[PDB]
Amino acid sequence: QVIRGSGVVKAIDMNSKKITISHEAIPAVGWPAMTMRFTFVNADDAIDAINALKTGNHVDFSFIQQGNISLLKSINVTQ
Ligand SMILES: [Zn+2]
């Protein structure tokens, strides 16, 4: 139920708490490569996403599915 992904951060919205990630195929849930919105709960996850947005560096992340909400459980940026 914890799903892992990778991609590039393309957008962040602090009102909706949404990180837009252009992610790779995720075979565990049968999703193709897409640009999709993930919800963050913690300022740390947002600050990692914001540094990824600046650099364009690849990001690894995990989330769970609640319908239209993909809830971020972790995020790592890679220099
Ligand atoms: Zn912290």
Residue numbers in the entry: 14 to 92
What text does the study give?
The periplasmic chaperone SilF has been identified as part of an Ag(I) detoxification system in Gram-negative bacteria. Biophysical and biochemical analysis of proteins comprising the sil gene cluster has been limited to date, with sequence homology used to infer function and the proposed resistance mechanism, after comparison with the more extensively studied cus and cue systems. Such analysis is consistent with the model that the SilF is a periplasmic metal-binding chaperone capable of binding both Ag(I) and Cu(I) ions and shuttling them to the SilCBA complex to aid metal ion detoxification. The protein has a β-barrel topology composed of five β-stands arranged in the β1-β2-β3-β5-β4-β1, similar to that observed for Cu(I) chaperone CusF. The X-ray crystal structures show that the metal ion–binding site is formed from strictly conserved residues His63, Trp71, Met74, and Met76 located at one end of the β-barrel.
Next, we determined the structure of SilF38-120 using X-ray protein crystallography. Unlike CusF, SilF38-120 has an additional 15 amino acid α-helix positioned between strands β3-β5. In CusF, this is an extended loop with no discernable helical or sheet secondary structural elements. RMSDs derived from the Cα atoms are 0.99 Å for Ag(I)/Apo and 1.09 Å for Cu(I)/Apo. Larger deviations are observed primarily in the metal-binding site, the top of the α-helix, and the final loop that leads into the C terminus. Recalculating RMSDs with these two regions missing reduces the value to 0.68 Å for Ag(I)/Apo and 0.98 Å for Cu(I)/Apo, showing that changes in flexibility is confined to the binding site and these regions. Although we do not see appreciable changes in helix formation from the crystal structures, most likely due to crystal packing forces, both of the solution experimental observations are well supported by the simulations where changes in helicity are clearly over long simulation times between the apo and holo SilF. Together, these show that the capping helix is unstable in the apo-protein and indeed could be unfolded to a degree in solution, as observed for CusF, with metal binding stabilizing the helix by an as-yet undefined allosteric mechanism.
